Design an enzyme around this catalytic site. Structure first.
Site, mmCIF file in Angstrom:
data_model
loop_
_atom_site.group_PDB
_atom_site.id
_atom_site.type_symbol
_atom_site.label_atom_id
_atom_site.label_comp_id
_atom_site.label_asym_id
_atom_site.label_seq_id
_atom_site.Cartn_x
_atom_site.Cartn_y
_atom_site.Cartn_z
ATOM 1 N N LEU A 14 -16.847 -7.718 -5.770
ATOM 2 C CA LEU A 14 -16.842 -7.049 -7.240
ATOM 3 C C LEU A 14 -15.543 -7.529 -7.802
ATOM 4 O O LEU A 14 -15.376 -7.586 -8.910
ATOM 5 C CB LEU A 14 -17.107 -5.864 -7.345
ATOM 6 C CG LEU A 14 -18.538 -5.416 -6.718
ATOM 7 C CD1 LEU A 14 -18.493 -3.570 -6.287
ATOM 8 C CD2 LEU A 14 -19.693 -5.679 -7.736
ATOM 9 N N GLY A 15 -14.333 -7.322 -7.028
ATOM 10 C CA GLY A 15 -12.974 -7.564 -7.379
ATOM 11 C C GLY A 15 -11.939 -7.429 -6.369
ATOM 12 O O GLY A 15 -12.364 -6.537 -5.237
ATOM 13 N N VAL A 16 -10.779 -7.483 -6.600
ATOM 14 C CA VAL A 16 -9.785 -7.087 -5.757
ATOM 15 C C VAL A 16 -8.873 -5.957 -6.422
ATOM 16 O O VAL A 16 -8.225 -6.227 -7.475
ATOM 17 C CB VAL A 16 -8.812 -8.324 -5.393
ATOM 18 C CG1 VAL A 16 -7.596 -7.657 -4.488
ATOM 19 C CG2 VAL A 16 -9.601 -9.271 -4.499
ATOM 20 N N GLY A 17 -8.695 -5.147 -5.914
ATOM 21 C CA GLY A 17 -7.730 -3.776 -6.444
ATOM 22 C C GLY A 17 -6.530 -3.887 -6.212
ATOM 23 O O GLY A 17 -6.078 -4.836 -5.854
ATOM 24 N N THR A 18 -5.946 -2.523 -6.395
ATOM 25 C CA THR A 18 -4.408 -2.416 -5.939
ATOM 26 C C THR A 18 -4.104 -2.856 -4.611
ATOM 27 O O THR A 18 -3.532 -3.619 -4.282
ATOM 28 C CB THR A 18 -3.842 -1.197 -6.650
ATOM 29 O OG1 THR A 18 -4.113 -1.029 -7.933
ATOM 30 C CG2 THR A 18 -2.439 -1.075 -6.189
ATOM 31 N N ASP A 131 -2.549 3.906 -14.035
ATOM 32 C CA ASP A 131 -3.016 2.481 -13.927
ATOM 33 C C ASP A 131 -4.113 2.609 -15.139
ATOM 34 O O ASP A 131 -4.594 1.543 -15.413
ATOM 35 C CB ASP A 131 -3.457 2.128 -12.961
ATOM 36 C CG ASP A 131 -3.520 0.406 -12.985
ATOM 37 O OD1 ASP A 131 -2.762 -0.184 -13.953
ATOM 38 O OD2 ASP A 131 -4.185 -0.229 -12.046
HETATM 39 C C1 R34 Z 1 -6.345 -10.945 2.280
HETATM 40 C C2 R34 Z 1 -7.154 -9.990 3.247
HETATM 41 C C3 R34 Z 1 -7.408 -10.516 4.572
HETATM 42 C C4 R34 Z 1 -8.075 -9.855 5.523
HETATM 43 C C5 R34 Z 1 -8.410 -8.630 5.096
HETATM 44 O O1 R34 Z 1 -9.257 -7.890 5.925
HETATM 45 C C6 R34 Z 1 -10.525 -7.852 6.107
HETATM 46 N N1 R34 Z 1 -11.355 -8.526 5.290
HETATM 47 C C7 R34 Z 1 -12.420 -8.343 5.358
HETATM 48 C C8 R34 Z 1 -13.882 -8.788 5.084
HETATM 49 C C9 R34 Z 1 -14.973 -8.406 5.461
HETATM 50 C C10 R34 Z 1 -16.112 -8.884 4.706
HETATM 51 C C11 R34 Z 1 -17.258 -8.024 4.481
HETATM 52 C C12 R34 Z 1 -18.674 -8.690 3.801
HETATM 53 C C13 R34 Z 1 -18.592 -10.297 3.951
HETATM 54 C C14 R34 Z 1 -17.848 -10.823 4.701
HETATM 55 C C15 R34 Z 1 -18.383 -12.303 4.510
HETATM 56 C C16 R34 Z 1 -19.311 -12.097 3.934
HETATM 57 N N2 R34 Z 1 -19.601 -10.899 3.753
HETATM 58 C C17 R34 Z 1 -20.880 -10.611 2.758
HETATM 59 C C18 R34 Z 1 -16.741 -10.383 5.077
HETATM 60 C C19 R34 Z 1 -15.014 -7.223 6.223
HETATM 61 CL CL1 R34 Z 1 -16.586 -6.529 6.989
HETATM 62 C C20 R34 Z 1 -13.845 -6.566 6.906
HETATM 63 C C21 R34 Z 1 -12.541 -7.197 6.438
HETATM 64 N N3 R34 Z 1 -11.319 -7.062 6.545
HETATM 65 C C22 R34 Z 1 -8.172 -8.000 3.924
HETATM 66 C C23 R34 Z 1 -7.375 -8.866 2.926
HETATM 67 C C24 R34 Z 1 -7.336 -7.822 1.750
HETATM 68 O O2 R34 Z 1 -6.406 -7.258 1.351
HETATM 69 N N4 R34 Z 1 -8.028 -8.590 0.343
HETATM 70 O O3 R34 Z 1 -8.513 -9.715 0.459
#
Ligand code: R34
Ligand code: AMP
Lengths: 386, 300, 174
Positions: A14-18, A131
């Site tokens: 949906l988006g990236v928050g704070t 915000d």
């Molecule tokens: C930059 C960043 C890198 C890594 C991060 O940590 C995590 N990212 C994640 C993504 C997923 C996730 C969720 C649904 C998904 C995928 C694939 C298909 N679908 C449909 C990955 C999960 Cl279950 C846990 C996570 N933990 C968070 C960030 C962040 O802070 N925002 O990007």
């Protein structure tokens, strides 16, 4: 092997928050949709926000309001924290105004009443969003405003100010772009005033491509009022958009304003003879002031205070050049008295020392916490005036 | 039990504390003339006394203490009262309290109204300080008038027991014998002396035939500090009460045939401490105070 | 119940096909969902030790950034320890987050909030003189005073007990 958390199948972003990333989710059985904010535990360690995240969860978990996004559950995993929140399909209010333009008087008022009800509910619970903007106002299928993205929020505490310039410049109060102290509801009101302008005019009151010009417009408090605007709501905007926070409208003021009252739903807000006691005095007035003031130099007066605290045999921890925390041992009860000190500026020459009582979480204690605070301050004030 | 006794058991002292209120506290080392002047300045009739040496609240400084100092040390209008100006709250408290040592005890905010009304009667006091035992801070000064106004707002909604429809005579509420009273020409100093001897809230001012034309209360005495006329007590109580004759209210009264409910309504509406019981000719039969009524209501 | 605890397995990088094999699935190849270079599955695991490895475009590999374990046969697997304190939200936030004696810029501009003094505000003549306005929360616990006069100092501060406020005045000789 699709990604699934607590029976909800995670879909598109949906988006990236704070802090963190927000993905939609859909219940594998009922098809119920949720918004899932994903906080990586290692990331909230990198940025040292773990306390902010903990308070956000603690307070937002208790919130129930029609126009604030509800937090259903917080699922902790070894690597990540999943905040499961209610989902709304209308998307951002910002996108709505982009596509449909300005909203008419009646629809602008309806949405504004909904938002302000939420802003109020937060303040009643001692929470300040900071915000607020159309990008963080979400619409549901029926065009009901929903506040979200409390990432930049903070909590109001008795006797405490908050200094953190937050939010987008266009929605920030003059004191926020100036980097000053604030109680925090006056900032949310300024933001809400800009939101109201955006609903009515379809544009922004303070905007420009030259950032110095933008900040001048905000600190001057000057914006254009289209001819089609109702004079009544113009007076409302002028009061909410006061540069001086002491002259700026409160939520009470807005609820009493005639334009706001018009067509207001009831669910939004939960709510001659002289006195005998004052008779002897009349048959017969000093002005109070805050702390202690000096026209001397801030280096000279900050040094004197450190000297005087030592004279009184007090224990003190330095935080800032202008912020001190002092402790005194009670010679009778053998308990401790705690107070904090801060130097401020009043005008060019005048500076002011502020005394603030520090509460104790300790078990029942002898003596009066209030009076011991007074006695402790008086000893120092005597020295500083002499 | 009754409608009133169970009500006062239910509610907590905290329920009567105003949303936002002012509390004045005097250090016991404060010059006692300054302390009485401060009471006038703040519109407060009594204040907590704090001892820096013992790090505890000691007692209350009331208008009664002002009356005692005047009567005790007043010599004449030709010479200042030296003790009034020179003494400190503690110094006079030692002289006055030397004969009898009593330790003032605060009432916790979590205690009930039945505890408070019981404490006011048992100690024969009109001022009960509410102190938080956790913080040790004094919170609110609780009075008979505050409690009765609270009962009036709350109990009028509900059914009231048969005791409330009984006449003042049947219930025998108030003092009907040995009524301490003065004359229109009685000097203030003499009236103060009667306050000291009889320890009464107020003295009816009567004419030739015993008909009440006014009332001189303990509260009225504080006007001496307000106008700084305390150094002449030779004037009559009539001359002392001229200050309030600008908007004068005829002294309030009640009759023996009237019901307790009628009387309490008159008290709360007028916001006064007591009513003078009189006959057809306004001659003083007795006096019904708030402490009399609150004792009648606290007992089944 | 307590034996089903959600655990996230994430591979960061590119790929056409990414699989997850572990002790928990008998080293079968479980396909991971791709989200723009992030590949993920979430699995309910028992509390305890589990070992796993990734299959990325035909190459068996561990995750270098996560913990690993090497056997006496030269096998390098990733290892994960499932703990209860990982699934209790406030236990996890607790473990994630890990003088006064005297040893001796410009001053912040004073907030105008503090210049509104609850005792300078006039109250109606028809009301009890002890009654006061309801204070801004930000001025609570702050010390206000009167200019010392006749050798007597007058201090005051507003405090808050439950839903009530009490402004206390103190007269002290100095
Ligand atoms: C930059 C960043 C890198 C890594 C991060 O940590 C995590 N990212 C994640 C993504 C997923 C996730 C969720 C649904 C998904 C995928 C694939 C298909 N679908 C449909 C990955 C999960 Cl279950 C846990 C996570 N933990 C968070 C960030 C962040 O802070 N925002 O990007
Ligand atoms: N002027 C007075 N003469 C005699 N008794 C009084 C007088 N005023 C009050 N009392 C009694 O003194 C007791 C305490 O009442 P008060 O001093 O009004 O709180 C009650 O029994 C009153 O009836």
């Amino acid at each position: 092997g699709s990604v699934k958390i607590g029976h909800y199948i995670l879909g598109d972003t949906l988006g990236v928050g704070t802090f963190g990333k927000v993905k939609v989710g859909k219940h594998e059985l009922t098809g119920h949709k949720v918004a899932v904010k994903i906080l990586n535990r290692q990331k909230i360690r990198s940025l040292d926000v773990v306390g902010k995240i903990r308070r956000e969860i603690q307070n937002l978990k208790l919130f129930r309001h029609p126009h604030i996004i509800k937090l259903y559950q917080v699922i902790s995993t070894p690597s990540d924290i999943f905040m499961v929140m209610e989902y709304v399909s209308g998307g951002e209010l910002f996108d709505y105004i982009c596509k449909n333009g300005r909203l008419d008087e009646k629809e602008s008022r309806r949405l504004f009443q909904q938002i302000l009800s939420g802003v109020d509910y937060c303040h009643r619970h001692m929470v300040v969003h900071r915000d607020l903007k159309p990008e963080n106002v979400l619409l549901d299928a029926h065009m009901n405003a929903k506040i979200a993205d409390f990432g930049l929020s903070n909590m109001m505490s008795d006797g405490e100010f908050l200094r953190t310039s937050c939010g987008s410049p266009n929605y920030a109060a003059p004191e926020v772009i100036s980097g000053r102290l604030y109680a925090g509801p006056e900032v949310d009101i300024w933001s809400s005033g800009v939101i109201l302008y955006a609903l009515l005019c379809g544009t922004l009151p303070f905007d420009d491509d030259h950032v110095p010009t933008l900040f001048k417009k905000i600190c001057d408090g000057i914006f254009y009022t289209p001819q089609y605007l109702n004079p009544s709501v113009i007076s409302l905007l002028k009061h909410m958009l006061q540069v001086d926070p002491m002259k700026r409208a409160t939520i009470k003021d807005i609820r009493e304003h005639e334009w706001f009252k018009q067509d207001l739903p009831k669910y939004l807000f939960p709510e001659t003879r002289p006195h005998p006691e004052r008779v002897p005095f009349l048959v017969a007035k000093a002005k109070w002031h805050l702390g202690i003031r000096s026209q001397s130099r801030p280096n000279d007066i900050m040094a004197e205070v450190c000297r005087a605290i030592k004279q009184l045999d007090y224990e003190w921890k330095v935080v800032n050049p202008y912020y001190l925390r002092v402790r005194r041992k009670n010679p009778v009860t053998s308990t401790y008295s705690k107070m904090s000190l801060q130097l401020y500026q009043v005008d060019s020459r005048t500076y002011l020392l502020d005394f603030r009582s520090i509460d104790d979480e300790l078990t029942p204690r002898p003596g009066s916490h209030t009076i011991e605070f007074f006695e402790m301050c008086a000893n120092l004030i005597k020295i500083l005036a002499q | 039990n009754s409608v009133y006794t169970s009500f006062m058991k239910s509610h907590r002292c905290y329920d009567l504390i105003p949303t936002s209120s002012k509390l004045v506290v005097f250090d016991t080392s404060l010059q006692v003339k300054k302390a009485f002047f401060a009471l006038v300045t703040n519109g407060v009739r009594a204040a907590p006394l704090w001892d820096s040496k013992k790090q505890s609240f000691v007692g209350m400084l009331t208008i009664t203490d002002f009356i005692n100092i005047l009567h005790r040390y007043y010599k004449s209008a030709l010479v200042q009262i030296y003790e009034l100006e020179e003494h400190k709250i503690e110094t006079w408290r030692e002289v006055y309290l030397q004969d009898s040592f009593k330790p003032l005890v605060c009432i916790s905010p979590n205690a009930s109204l039945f505890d408070a009304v019981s404490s006011l009667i048992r100690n024969k006091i009109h001022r009960l300080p509410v102190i938080d035992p956790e913080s040790g801070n004094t919170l609110y000064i609780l009075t008979h008038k505050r409690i009765l106004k609270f009962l009036k707002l709350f109990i009028t909604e509900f059914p009231k027991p048969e005791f409330m429809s009984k006449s003042l005579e049947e219930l025998q509420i108030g003092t009907y014998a040995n009524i301490a009273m003065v004359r229109t020409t009685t000097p203030v100093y003499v009236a103060l002396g009667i306050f000291v001897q009889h320890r009464v809230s107020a003295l009816p001012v009567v004419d030739e035939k015993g008909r009440v034309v006014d009332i001189y209360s303990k509260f009225d005495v504080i006007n001496l500090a307000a106008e700084k006329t305390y150094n002449n007590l030779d004037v009559s109580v009539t001359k002392a009460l001229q200050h309030r004759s600008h908007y004068f209210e005829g002294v309030l009264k009640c009759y023996l045939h009237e019901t307790l409910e009628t009387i309490i309504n008159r008290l709360v509406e007028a916001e006064v401490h007591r009513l003078v019981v009189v006959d057809e000719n306004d001659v003083v039969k007795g006096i019904v105070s708030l402490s009399d009524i609150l004792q009648a209501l606290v007992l089944t | 119940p307590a034996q089903a605890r959600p655990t996230v397995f994430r591979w960061t990088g590119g790929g056409k096909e990414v699989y997850l094999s572990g002790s928990f699935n008998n080293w079968s190849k479980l396909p991971l969902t791709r989200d723009h270079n992030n590949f993920v599955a979430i699995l309910d695991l028992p509390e305890g030790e589990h070992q796993y490895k990734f299959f990325v475009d035909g190459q068996w590999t561990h995750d270098p950034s996560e913990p690993i374990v090497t056997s006496q046969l030269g096998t390098v697997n990733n290892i994960i320890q499932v703990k209860k304190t990982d699934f209790e939200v406030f236990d996890a936030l607790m473990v994630d987050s890990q003088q006064e004696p005297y040893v001796c810029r410009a001053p912040p501009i004073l907030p105008p909030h503090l210049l509104q003094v609850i005792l300078n505000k006039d109250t109606g003549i028809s009301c009890d003189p002890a009654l006061l306005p309801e204070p801004n929360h930000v001025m609570l616990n702050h010390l206000y005073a009167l200019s010392i006069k006749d050798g007597v100092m007058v201090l005051s501060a507003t405090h808050r007990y439950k839903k009530k406020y009490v402004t206390t005045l103190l007269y002290k000789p100095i």
